[PDB]
Amino acid sequence: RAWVSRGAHKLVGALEAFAIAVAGRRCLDAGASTGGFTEVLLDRGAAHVVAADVGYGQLAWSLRNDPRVVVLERTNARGLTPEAIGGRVDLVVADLSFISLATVLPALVGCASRDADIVPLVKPQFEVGKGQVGPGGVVHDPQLRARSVLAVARRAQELGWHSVGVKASPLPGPSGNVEYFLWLRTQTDRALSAKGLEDAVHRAISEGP
Ligand SMILES: [Cl-]
């Protein structure tokens, strides 16, 4: 509940920062821990949302019963395919815990159309190496958070997916980690250059939540 509010607030921050249209589009929520992302997508006029159930907890039935929502069960983010979700989508969102986006990005890409937006939430606490998460489970070093974002961007680019924008999530995670949405597209004329991405990342880190 409180958690659904928090998820919804985060994704509105992302959609607005990036000017991504949702109306009439097919969407995938790659790790629906809360129905927050899903509710926002419905609210902003998605034609259809595939919500991948994480296997613990429970998405609200009222969400499951919505005619525009398919809850996909028994399948973590790396296992997702077009076949599994009923075809390629126009918008992919992911708020995943305890896993690096580098490992999941190939499946997410595999679920996306040519013309799609992919907007993962980069969580440095699950990207940095051992010894680098500080006291309280937070990545305190802003340069490490920046590198985290750049590493995911590099991984995406190896896959043909360019970085178009970065935006700090307006709420920190519950233990205090600042987390960052990265906007990825493969068909674009406004892809950030290396310097352009560095600038985008540095401003996002300096802004904060
Ligand atoms: Cl956190």
CSV table of C-alpha atoms and ligand atoms in Angstrom, one decimal:
chain,number,residue,atom,x,y,z
A,1,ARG,CA,0.0,0.0,0.0
A,2,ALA,CA,2.5,2.5,1.2
A,3,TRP,CA,4.8,0.7,-1.1
A,4,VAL,CA,2.3,1.0,-4.1
A,5,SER,CA,2.2,4.8,-3.5
A,6,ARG,CA,6.1,4.9,-3.5
A,7,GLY,CA,6.4,2.9,-6.7
A,8,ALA,CA,3.8,5.1,-8.5
A,9,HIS,CA,5.5,8.3,-7.5
A,10,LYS,CA,8.8,7.1,-8.8
A,11,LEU,CA,7.6,6.1,-12.2
A,12,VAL,CA,5.6,9.4,-12.7
A,13,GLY,CA,9.0,11.2,-12.0
A,14,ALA,CA,10.5,9.1,-14.8
A,15,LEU,CA,7.7,9.4,-17.4
A,16,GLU,CA,7.5,13.2,-17.0
A,17,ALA,CA,11.3,13.8,-16.9
A,18,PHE,CA,11.7,11.8,-20.2
A,19,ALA,CA,8.4,12.8,-21.9
A,20,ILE,CA,7.6,9.2,-22.7
A,21,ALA,CA,4.0,8.7,-24.0
A,22,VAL,CA,2.2,5.7,-22.6
A,23,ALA,CA,-1.3,6.2,-24.1
A,24,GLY,CA,-2.3,3.2,-26.3
A,25,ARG,CA,1.0,1.3,-25.7
A,26,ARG,CA,1.7,-2.3,-24.7
A,27,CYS,CA,3.9,-2.4,-21.6
A,28,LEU,CA,6.0,-4.8,-19.5
A,29,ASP,CA,6.8,-4.4,-15.8
A,30,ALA,CA,9.8,-6.8,-15.5
A,31,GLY,CA,9.7,-7.3,-11.7
A,32,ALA,CA,6.4,-6.2,-10.3
A,33,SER,CA,7.1,-6.2,-6.6
A,34,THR,CA,4.3,-3.7,-6.1
A,35,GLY,CA,1.4,-2.8,-8.5
A,36,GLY,CA,2.6,0.8,-8.4
A,37,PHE,CA,4.2,0.9,-11.8
A,38,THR,CA,1.3,-1.0,-13.3
A,39,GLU,CA,-1.3,1.4,-11.8
A,40,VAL,CA,0.6,4.4,-13.2
A,41,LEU,CA,0.7,2.8,-16.6
A,42,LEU,CA,-3.0,2.1,-16.6
A,43,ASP,CA,-3.7,5.6,-15.4
A,44,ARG,CA,-1.7,7.1,-18.2
A,45,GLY,CA,-3.7,5.1,-20.8
A,46,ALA,CA,-1.6,2.0,-21.5
A,47,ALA,CA,-3.5,-0.4,-23.8
A,48,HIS,CA,-2.0,-3.4,-22.0
A,49,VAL,CA,0.4,-4.2,-19.1
A,50,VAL,CA,2.3,-7.5,-18.6
A,51,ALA,CA,3.3,-7.6,-14.9
A,52,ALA,CA,6.0,-10.3,-14.1
A,53,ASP,CA,5.1,-11.7,-10.6
A,54,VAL,CA,8.2,-12.1,-8.4
A,55,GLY,CA,6.8,-15.2,-6.6
A,56,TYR,CA,6.6,-13.8,-3.0
A,57,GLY,CA,4.1,-11.3,-1.7
A,58,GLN,CA,0.9,-10.8,-3.7
A,59,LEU,CA,-0.3,-8.4,-6.4
A,60,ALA,CA,-3.8,-7.2,-5.6
A,61,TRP,CA,-6.5,-9.2,-7.3
A,62,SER,CA,-8.3,-6.1,-8.4
A,63,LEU,CA,-5.1,-5.5,-10.5
A,64,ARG,CA,-5.0,-9.0,-11.8
A,65,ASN,CA,-8.7,-8.8,-12.7
A,66,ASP,CA,-8.3,-5.7,-14.8
A,67,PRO,CA,-8.9,-6.6,-18.5
A,68,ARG,CA,-5.8,-4.6,-19.5
A,69,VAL,CA,-3.5,-6.5,-17.1
A,70,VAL,CA,-1.8,-10.0,-17.5
A,71,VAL,CA,0.1,-11.2,-14.5
A,72,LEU,CA,2.8,-13.6,-15.6
A,73,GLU,CA,3.7,-16.2,-13.0
A,74,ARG,CA,6.7,-18.3,-12.2
A,75,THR,CA,9.3,-16.5,-14.4
A,76,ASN,CA,12.1,-14.2,-13.2
A,77,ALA,CA,13.4,-11.4,-15.4
A,78,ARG,CA,16.2,-13.4,-17.2
A,79,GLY,CA,13.6,-15.9,-18.3
A,80,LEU,CA,11.3,-13.4,-20.1
A,81,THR,CA,10.7,-13.9,-23.8
A,82,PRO,CA,8.2,-12.4,-26.4
A,83,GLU,CA,6.5,-15.8,-26.4
A,84,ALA,CA,6.1,-15.8,-22.6
A,85,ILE,CA,4.6,-12.3,-22.6
A,86,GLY,CA,2.4,-12.5,-25.7
A,87,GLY,CA,4.7,-10.6,-28.1
A,88,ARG,CA,7.1,-7.6,-28.1
A,89,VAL,CA,6.2,-4.5,-26.2
A,90,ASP,CA,6.5,-0.7,-26.6
A,91,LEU,CA,7.7,0.2,-23.1
A,92,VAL,CA,9.7,-1.8,-20.6
A,93,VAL,CA,10.1,-0.8,-16.9
A,94,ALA,CA,12.1,-2.7,-14.3
A,95,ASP,CA,12.5,-2.1,-10.6
A,96,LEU,CA,14.5,-5.2,-9.7
A,97,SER,CA,16.1,-6.2,-6.4
A,98,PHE,CA,19.3,-8.2,-5.6
A,99,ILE,CA,20.4,-8.5,-9.3
A,100,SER,CA,22.6,-6.4,-11.6
A,101,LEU,CA,20.8,-4.9,-14.7
A,102,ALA,CA,23.7,-6.1,-16.9
A,103,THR,CA,22.6,-9.7,-16.3
A,104,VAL,CA,19.0,-9.0,-17.0
A,105,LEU,CA,19.3,-6.4,-19.9
A,106,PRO,CA,19.5,-9.0,-22.7
A,107,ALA,CA,16.1,-10.5,-21.8
A,108,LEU,CA,14.5,-7.1,-21.5
A,109,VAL,CA,15.9,-6.1,-24.9
A,110,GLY,CA,14.6,-9.3,-26.3
A,111,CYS,CA,11.1,-8.3,-25.2
A,112,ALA,CA,11.2,-4.8,-26.8
A,113,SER,CA,10.1,-3.6,-30.2
A,114,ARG,CA,12.5,-1.6,-32.4
A,115,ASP,CA,10.5,1.6,-31.5
A,116,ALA,CA,10.3,0.9,-27.8
A,117,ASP,CA,11.5,2.7,-24.7
A,118,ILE,CA,13.3,0.7,-22.0
A,119,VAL,CA,13.5,2.5,-18.7
A,120,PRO,CA,15.3,0.5,-16.0
A,121,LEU,CA,15.9,1.8,-12.5
A,122,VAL,CA,19.6,1.6,-11.8
A,123,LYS,CA,20.2,0.6,-8.2
A,124,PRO,CA,24.0,1.1,-7.4
A,125,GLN,CA,23.7,-1.1,-4.3
A,126,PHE,CA,23.1,-4.1,-6.6
A,127,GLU,CA,25.8,-2.9,-9.3
A,128,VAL,CA,28.9,-2.1,-7.3
A,129,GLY,CA,31.5,-4.7,-6.3
A,130,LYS,CA,32.3,-6.2,-2.9
A,131,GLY,CA,33.5,-3.8,-0.2
A,132,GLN,CA,31.8,-0.8,-1.9
A,133,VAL,CA,28.3,-0.8,-0.3
A,134,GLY,CA,28.8,1.3,2.8
A,135,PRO,CA,27.3,1.2,6.3
A,136,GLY,CA,23.5,0.8,6.4
A,137,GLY,CA,23.5,-0.9,3.0
A,138,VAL,CA,23.9,2.3,1.1
A,139,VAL,CA,26.3,3.3,-1.7
A,140,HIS,CA,27.6,6.6,-0.1
A,141,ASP,CA,30.2,7.4,-2.7
A,142,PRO,CA,28.6,9.5,-5.5
A,143,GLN,CA,31.3,8.5,-8.0
A,144,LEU,CA,30.5,4.8,-7.5
A,145,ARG,CA,26.8,5.6,-8.1
A,146,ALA,CA,27.8,7.4,-11.3
A,147,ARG,CA,30.0,4.5,-12.5
A,148,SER,CA,27.1,2.1,-11.8
A,149,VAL,CA,24.9,4.1,-14.1
A,150,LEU,CA,27.6,4.2,-16.8
A,151,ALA,CA,28.2,0.4,-16.5
A,152,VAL,CA,24.6,-0.3,-17.3
A,153,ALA,CA,24.7,2.2,-20.1
A,154,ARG,CA,27.7,0.5,-21.6
A,155,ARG,CA,26.0,-2.9,-21.3
A,156,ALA,CA,22.9,-1.5,-23.1
A,157,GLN,CA,25.0,-0.1,-25.8
A,158,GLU,CA,26.8,-3.4,-26.5
A,159,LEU,CA,23.2,-4.7,-27.1
A,160,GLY,CA,22.5,-1.8,-29.6
A,161,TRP,CA,20.5,0.3,-27.0
A,162,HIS,CA,21.5,3.9,-26.6
A,163,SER,CA,21.2,6.2,-23.6
A,164,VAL,CA,18.8,9.1,-24.1
A,165,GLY,CA,18.4,10.4,-20.6
A,166,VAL,CA,19.1,10.0,-16.9
A,167,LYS,CA,16.9,11.0,-14.0
A,168,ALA,CA,17.3,10.3,-10.2
A,169,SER,CA,14.3,8.6,-8.7
A,170,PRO,CA,12.4,11.2,-6.6
A,171,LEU,CA,12.4,8.8,-3.7
A,172,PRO,CA,15.4,7.0,-2.2
A,173,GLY,CA,14.9,3.2,-1.5
A,174,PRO,CA,13.9,2.3,2.0
A,175,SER,CA,17.4,2.0,3.3
A,176,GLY,CA,18.3,5.3,1.7
A,177,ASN,CA,20.0,4.4,-1.6
A,178,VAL,CA,19.6,6.9,-4.3
A,179,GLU,CA,18.6,5.2,-7.6
A,180,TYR,CA,18.5,6.4,-11.2
A,181,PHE,CA,16.3,5.8,-14.2
A,182,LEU,CA,18.2,5.4,-17.5
A,183,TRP,CA,16.2,6.0,-20.7
A,184,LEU,CA,17.2,3.6,-23.5
A,185,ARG,CA,16.2,3.5,-27.1
A,186,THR,CA,17.6,1.7,-30.2
A,187,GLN,CA,15.8,3.9,-32.8
A,188,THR,CA,16.6,7.5,-31.9
A,189,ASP,CA,18.2,10.6,-33.3
A,190,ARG,CA,18.7,12.1,-29.8
A,191,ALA,CA,21.1,9.5,-28.3
A,192,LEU,CA,23.5,11.0,-25.9
A,193,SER,CA,27.2,11.2,-26.8
A,194,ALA,CA,29.8,9.9,-24.2
A,195,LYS,CA,30.3,13.4,-22.9
A,196,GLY,CA,26.6,14.0,-23.1
A,197,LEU,CA,25.9,10.9,-20.9
A,198,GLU,CA,28.6,11.9,-18.4
A,199,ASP,CA,27.0,15.3,-18.0
A,200,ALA,CA,23.5,13.8,-17.7
A,201,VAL,CA,24.8,11.4,-15.0
A,202,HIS,CA,26.7,14.0,-13.1
A,203,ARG,CA,23.7,16.3,-12.9
A,204,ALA,CA,21.5,13.4,-11.8
A,205,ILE,CA,23.9,12.5,-9.0
A,206,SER,CA,24.2,16.2,-7.9
A,207,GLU,CA,20.4,16.8,-7.9
A,208,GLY,CA,19.7,13.7,-5.8
A,209,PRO,CA,16.2,12.4,-4.9
B,1,CL,CL,17.7,1.2,-0.3
